[PDB]
Amino acid sequence: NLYQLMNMIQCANTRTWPSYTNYGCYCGKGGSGTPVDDLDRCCYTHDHCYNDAKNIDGCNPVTKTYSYTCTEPTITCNDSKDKCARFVCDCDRTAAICFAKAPYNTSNVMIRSTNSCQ
Numbered sequence: 001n002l003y004q005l006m007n008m009i010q011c012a013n014t015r016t017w018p019s020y021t022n023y024g025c026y027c028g029k030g031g032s033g034t035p036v037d038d039l040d041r042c043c044y045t046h047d048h049c050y051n052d053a054k055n056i057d058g059c060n061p062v063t064k065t066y067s068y069t070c071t072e073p074t075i076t077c078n079d080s081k082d083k084c085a086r087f088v089c090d091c092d093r094t095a096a097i098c099f100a101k102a103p104y105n106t107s108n109v110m111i112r113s114t115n116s117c118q
């Protein structure tokens with residue numbers, strides 16, 4: 001779920017939401033070019049995770065609601081029986097964690113369509 005994903009990001013980092021809404025070549029809707037740094041690489045993978053998720057019947061990562069738990073900054077996926085809920089939760093979980101780990105370069109904030117993401 002796009003909103004739950006927001007919270008995993010909230011639950012695992014210091015950096016706010018708009019902080020990722022549009023950063024580098026892949027953080028944000030769709031992606032082009034080659035990832036910029038490793039934070040953008042987090043977004044690249046997330047993306048791909050979402051594409052694979054779509055390979056599950058009736059599975060829309062973007063709107064699927066799963067069961068997860070947060071205890072700043074640890075987050076857990078409680079889905080077992082719903083294959084889509086779990087695949088998507090791990091997708092989002094892995095991203096949040098990936099984000100908290102990566103450095104935040106302020107010069108990559110809006111290089112979109114600017115030519116490096118061909």
Ligand SMILES: CCCCCCCCCCCCC(=O)O
Pocket residue numbers: 017020021026027028029043046047
């Ligand atoms: C206010 C938040 C809603 C934004 C919806 C806009 C488009 C791209 C959104 C999220 C991408 C997060 C990460 O870079 O994968």
Ligand code: NA
Pocket residue numbers: 026027028029030031043047
């Ligand atoms: Na993207």
